[PDB]
Amino acid sequence: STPITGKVTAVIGAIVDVHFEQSELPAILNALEIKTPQGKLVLEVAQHLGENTVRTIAMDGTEGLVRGEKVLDTGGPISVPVGRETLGRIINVIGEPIDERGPIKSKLRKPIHADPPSFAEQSTSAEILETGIKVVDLLAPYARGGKIGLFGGAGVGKTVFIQELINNIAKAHGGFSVFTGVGERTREGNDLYREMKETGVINLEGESKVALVFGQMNEPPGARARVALTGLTIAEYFRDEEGQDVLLFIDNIFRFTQAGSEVSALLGRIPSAVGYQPTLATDMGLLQERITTTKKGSVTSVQAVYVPADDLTDPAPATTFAHLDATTVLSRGISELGIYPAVDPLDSKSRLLDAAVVGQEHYDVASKVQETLQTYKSLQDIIAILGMDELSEQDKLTVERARKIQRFLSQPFAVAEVFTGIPGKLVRLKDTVASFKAVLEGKYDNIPEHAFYMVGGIEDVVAKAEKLAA
Amino acid sequence: TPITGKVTAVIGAIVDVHFEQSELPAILNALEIKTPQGKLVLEVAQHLGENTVRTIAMDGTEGLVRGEKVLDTGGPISVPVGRETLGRIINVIGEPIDERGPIKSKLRKPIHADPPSFAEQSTSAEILETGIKVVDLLAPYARGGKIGLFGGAGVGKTVFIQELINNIAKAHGGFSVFTGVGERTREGNDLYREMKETGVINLEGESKVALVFGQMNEPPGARARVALTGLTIAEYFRDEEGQDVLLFIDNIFRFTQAGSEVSALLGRIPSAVGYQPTLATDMGLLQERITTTKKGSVTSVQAVYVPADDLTDPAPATTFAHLDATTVLSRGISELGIYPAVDPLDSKSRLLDAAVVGQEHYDVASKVQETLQTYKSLQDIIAILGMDELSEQDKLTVERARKIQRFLSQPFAVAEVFTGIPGKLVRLKDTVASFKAVLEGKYDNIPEHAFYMVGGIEDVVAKAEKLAA
Amino acid sequence: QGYAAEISARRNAMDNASKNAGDMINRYSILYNRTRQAVITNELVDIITGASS
Amino acid sequence: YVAVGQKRSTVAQLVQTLEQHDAMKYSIIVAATASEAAPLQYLAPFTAASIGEWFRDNGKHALIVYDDLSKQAVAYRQLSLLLRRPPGREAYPGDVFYLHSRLLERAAKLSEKEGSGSLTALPVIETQGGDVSAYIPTNVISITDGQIFLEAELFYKGIRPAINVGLSVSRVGSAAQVKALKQVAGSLKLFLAQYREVAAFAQF
Amino acid sequence: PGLLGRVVDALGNPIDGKGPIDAAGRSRAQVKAPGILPRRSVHEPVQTGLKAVDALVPIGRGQRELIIGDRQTGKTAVALDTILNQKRWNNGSDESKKLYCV
């Protein structure tokens, strides 16, 4: 059949070296299948080492391999299935459905690798997404076609933040979305599967307005790496060939970096800083560049990033930090303050915010908020030791507003009926600008601090003031 | 037929032999190249094939001309043990360096030995009264336990041990092993002298102590198997004599260190920092040969030269696991003039538990720990501000804690010379009484100099009169 | 009389504070410098070990 | 209870304690003592996991303690460098995350078609210097569903057992909390959080 | 001279597809800097148009001054501003005032 037949020579982890026969060069980045009593082990060809001996990375677990096993060649990068047939049905890295909602329903395939869209292809967005999440809406508006980036620490409900985004934004937007999970727990997986069945986004009968690619961290590091490529190609089929404007979601992209770092060592490369792959920049670059809004479709990626020990100075977060468009920083501390959303308001920044883009009023309002908060933080040290007393009357009004603004940001989420147990609230962007404007004007500086805490809009704050009064 | 070989390489003290004869001596066999200095004892550690071993060299490795005859003495070096090896100081190869004539031997046992099984273990719970107040309060020793020191650069590490020998080893009256790995010659000479002087070695009499001394002049490889030799001497006592013993090891940092040196030469990618990949296994083997079986209850005292006081360095870290109780000694606390220099917030014992040592003792100790932790907490405030800017309630605590710290300094009898103050041995019951009172501030109203460098509460009270004059 | 002593005391105290704080700056500065050097060296050693293989 | 790297004597005391407390009956103790080989130590959690899976498979509910996982990492380091594999960050092999993750992820609450079988897992990591940036601790933190930080200062402070409740998190939150206990402890979280903020201010 | 108003990639291929470059040489990219004697001391300013830059931190010509700062703080905006103020001078006809920014 495929004359490309190889005999294993060395199984040493993910590295499996094969000794293909004369004249058989399975090109770099091809996909090899080795028939095994476990199924077909997929090896992605990653080097030619000479005399028809390749060095390949495994994409499925290694065990039982016998030196000499016949190796067929698919002949090209892993060919996934694409279609609207991929909607619904969870798809594992190789492509096989692991929720087993029938066989591969797709009629088309595409390779995992692809060449990033050219400079010419790029189309500059300016449409402004509305998330309904107030901190986002005023202080770092997201853009429809954006590359939103959820830098944050583990266990802040990194997933929870994303779940809220899917909960609001995904259903709201008509277009398909692809939920791609890179190296996440099957606990999280089951929750996500259940949750989007619950929100009905996954429609078991009838088309789902989403496709799912759950890649979990129980898969070898190599397999973890090419979960990203797989998800991306599905998105590309939607973006390009169906022309749909999609909103990509990937989770957690530090796992993508981490995965690459692990197989770097195995590939025998000189380990770089904090053990990261030397190819860190270009590998990130290929992934990130592939994800973009073109003159074809518009992709709105939301990428979770895990910042190890909350040090953004760690090169891997910093590299991603450059490649993204609309950063969001989620302060663990602020989560602990009980403020949910847990966003770090000063550090969250989106280039999208501009007096032209969101209008002069929005800009001015947001400048005033930022200044108020920045002052509050600056004064926080003074209040700490000296004690607030000799800080001006003006300062006291600013501080009073800041403590209030700090808790006006707080606003429950429906998917944190699980957590907080408070039904969600999502307020229109235009309305949020108005409501925050009111706070700054100080018309509600007679309202108690706790009557701003964990509630929606200004109307709600007023209602909770009345409620607390009673 | 002694298995002959030639010396293929002489890369440091990790000589390599090539057995010309078929079938090489196995790993952990012992070999003699009969040097013009006497013999050199080498131990097979790798087989590199083609009948070429790579061997640890236990004596000096200079003057070696490549190609030298080998003879196979087989198996691990079998040291000589006996009930007549009591009071001998033996070299790495077991040769009596004290040279009170040829060694008296009966059974010679291999240096390497397997650690006794899970079922052979006997689990103790015995208390051992130290008489050192800080020890008694914070981490009371357990008889048959494994006690450990995590001191700085010979910060009276030896002195601390000497006090233990002085108190515990004359109290114990069982067999006892002193093994000093990488001991400095002066300290060794002093110990040998002291033992002979205090009759624990009576040279025409008999000794209830036996001695192994390994100088830090000794080549690194030699030092590695000084420890293993000592463990064998101990096993003979543990098993064959069947008596509860003592064992002193000073320092097992030198054991770890020695291993790290040889590791590079052996050809091992050296694990982080630099320690050998086999650091855990080697430490493990050593510390599981040191154990209280149902054949004997081996009380162990192990000393760790913490390298630059970095407990985070892998060798101290892996030591903490293998010790029943620890008494980490801190350079700062030494500077404060507290001898014992034992850190009081970094001490622990498994024996310290309310049921085990009485609820009252535990309560007293709890309060001391809490108080001292408060004092440590308020170190920041104390420096940044003054003392008067502390809350009044806290200021009482601080004053009490200052007293507690000073109270902890108790002169040692072996250090009586060095301190210039006669030593103090304080009873466990007395110690509890003393702290109990201090926590209730009963005698608190007297100088912190009064508490400084004196024994029990009665002594403190008496010294208050001295100061008052 | 009291108030003048109070404001005077505050001046004295805050002055002595500046001195005490300065000393702490110096102690942590030495620690900082040592720590900074140590990190560079230890990381470098790891990189070298990897290259050596 | 899975015991990796611990001395035979410590383990032996532990089993006695369990027998004293009459509970060895429902206990299995899987051990790989300090003496036992580095390969066997490396293999020890994964074979403990299998012992657990028999419960999980049976639909039986069980709990597996992997104490301390940190010494497994030391063992795998020993293996890898004497398998002459390229050294990773801190010399631990460059596939340690995969090893630890596969071990931990086998514990699960299965579905009712699988008889609601569950192995429950508690990994235990001894933190060296409390360095949460240390490679073995960092890796584990990502993998696990919650962290239950314990603090030494508070131990000395006399909270014994000590719990660094400020850094303790459960990302999978409260729903395994008894309904009654959820009601009573409803504002306990808020109160403690306020206590922390207030206490900090109070120093100065 | 034809690279004015041209976005080119590294190889020189116009990625803005403004067709073949009217480039009068292909010149090596590994050549050394003008010698000590081939320098004249700075005597021409550059006006960035940003007030602080123009007064507080003067910018000459043929000199290298760093722009070192925190990540993605719109570092590029500060730079781009210089290009814009140079438009005024560029519009002019003096060949010392025609700074062709790259």
User: Residue C40 belongs to a domain with what CATH number?
Assistant: 1.10.287.80
Verify whether the Cβ–Cβ distance A221 to D97 is below 8 Å: yes
Quick one: A99 and A165 in the same domain? yes
Residue A23: domain span: 2-77
Quick one: A23 and A94 in the same domain? no
Pick the residue from chain C with its C-alpha nearest to B385: C17
Task: Give the span between the Cα atoms of A46 and A42, in whole angstroms.
Answer: 12
Quick one: B129 and B89 in the same domain? yes
Classify residue A278 by its DSSP letter.
Answer: T
DSSP character string of A160-227: HHHHHHIIIIIHHS-S-EEEEEEEE-HHHHHHHHHHHHHTTSS-SSS--SEEEEEEETTS-HHHHHTH
- What is the CATH number for A112? 3.40.50.300
Q: Output the CA–CA distances (angstroms, integers) from residue A346 to A371, A378, A413, A435, E76, in the order listed.
A: 10, 12, 22, 20, 21
Quick one: A52 and A109 in the same domain? no
Classify residue A294 by its DSSP letter.
Answer: B
Task: Give the span between the Cα atoms of A354 and A345, in whole angstroms.
Answer: 17
Asked whether B261 and B320 are in contact (CB, 8 A), the reply is: no
Bridge-based pairing of strands B71-72 and B52-57 is: unpaired
| Domain end position, chosen among A25, A55, A77 | A77
Q: Which chains have 3+ CB pairs within 8 A of A?
A: C, D, E
Contacting residues of D for C46, CB less than 8 Å apart: 87, 89-91
Report CA dihedral (B384, B390, B394, B399) to the nearest 10 degrees: 80
- What is the CATH number for B42? 2.40.10.170
| Domain end position, chosen among B323, B351, B379 | B351
Report CA dihedral (D137, D141, D146, D147) to the nearest 10 degrees: 30
Token readout for D27 is 């206990």
Task: Give the span between the Cα atoms of A9 and A16, in whole angstroms.
Answer: 7
- Residue recorded with tokens 């999502």: A426
Pick the residue from chain D with its C-alpha nearest to A221: D98
Report CA dihedral (A134, A139, A143, A148) to the nearest 10 degrees: -90
The answer on whether E86 is annotated among ligand-binding residues is no
With CA atoms as reference, report the closest residue to D105 among B154, A220, A262, B280.
Answer: A220
Q: Output the CA–CA distances (angstroms, integers) from residue C24 to A381, B385, D200, in the order listed.
A: 18, 11, 21
Task: Give the span between the Cα atoms of B180 and B230, in whole angstroms.
Answer: 9
What Rg, from alpha-carbon coordinates, does chain A have? 25
Annotated binding site of B for ATP: 151-158
Strand order through the sheet with A71-73: A6-12, A15-20, A53-58, A39-48, A31-36, A71-73
Q: How many CA atoms lie within 13 A of B148 on its CB side?
A: 26
Quick one: B98 and B232 in the same domain? yes
The angle subtended at Cα A113 by Cα A108 and Cα A116, nearest 5°, is 110
Pick the residue from chain D with its C-alpha nearest to B288: D35
Quick one: B90 and B184 in the same domain? yes
Task: Give the span between the Cα atoms of E45 and B281, in whole angstroms.
Answer: 70
Verify whether the Cβ–Cβ distance A216 to D105 is below 8 Å: yes
Task: Give the span between the Cα atoms of D75 and D57, in whole angstroms.
Answer: 29
Verify whether the Cβ–Cβ distance D166 to A336 is below 8 Å: yes
Verify whether the Cβ–Cβ distance D158 to B369 is below 8 Å: yes
Q: Which residues are within 8 A (CB) of B66 and not within 5 positions of it... i.e. 6 or more apart?
A: B6, B7, B8, B9, B10
The angle subtended at Cα E20 by Cα E19 and Cα E24, nearest 5°, is 145
Total of domains in chain B: 3
Q: Going by beta carbons, is chain D in contact with chain A, meaning 3 or more pairs sit under 8 Å apart?
A: yes
Quick one: A330 and A391 in the same domain? no
Q: For E71, which of A120, A318, A351 is closest by C-beta distance?
A: A318
**Interface contact A386, partner C, CB < 8 A:** no
Task: Give the span between the Cα atoms of B281 and B277, in whole angstroms.
Answer: 8
**Solved using:** cryo-EM
Classify residue D173 by its DSSP letter.
Answer: -
Asked whether A47 and A29 are in contact (CB, 8 A), the reply is: no
Task: Give the span between the Cα atoms of A23 and E11, in whole angstroms.
Answer: 34
Q: How far separated are the first and last CA of chain C, in Å rounded?
A: 78
Q: Which amino acid, B223? A: R
Task: Give the span between the Cα atoms of A358 and A361, in whole angstroms.
Answer: 8
Buried b (16+ CB within 10 A) or exposed e, A317-350: bebbbebbbbbbbbbbebbbbbbbbbbbbeebbb
- Let me know how many helices (H) and strands (E) chain E has, helices first: 2, 0
Quick one: A216 and A362 in the same domain? no
Q: Å from B195 to nearest chain D CA?
A: 32
| Domain end position, chosen among B351, B386, B403 | B351
- What is the CATH number for A367? 1.10.1140.10
Contacting residues of E for A321, CB less than 8 Å apart: 71-72
Quick one: A124 and A249 in the same domain? yes
Q: Output the CA–CA distances (angstroms, integers) from residue E16 to A120, E1, E3, in the order listed.
A: 7, 17, 12
Residue C18: domain span: 14-53
Token readout for A249 is 């979601």
Q: Going by beta carbons, is chain E in contact with chain B, meaning 3 or more pairs sit under 8 Å apart?
A: no
Q: Is the peptide bond preceding residue A341 cis, with omega within 30 degrees of 0?
A: yes
Token readout for B221 is 């490889």
Contacting residues of A for D179, CB less than 8 Å apart: none
In chain E, at which residue ranges do the beta strands (DSSP E only) sit?
A: none
Quick one: A103 and A170 in the same domain? yes
With CA atoms as reference, report the closest residue to A71 among A29, A40, A105.
Answer: A40
Contacting residues of A for E72, CB less than 8 Å apart: 321-322
Asked whether A85 and A96 are in contact (CB, 8 A), the reply is: no
Quick one: A18 and A126 in the same domain? no
Q: Which amino acid, C19? A: K
The answer on whether A424 is annotated among ligand-binding residues is no
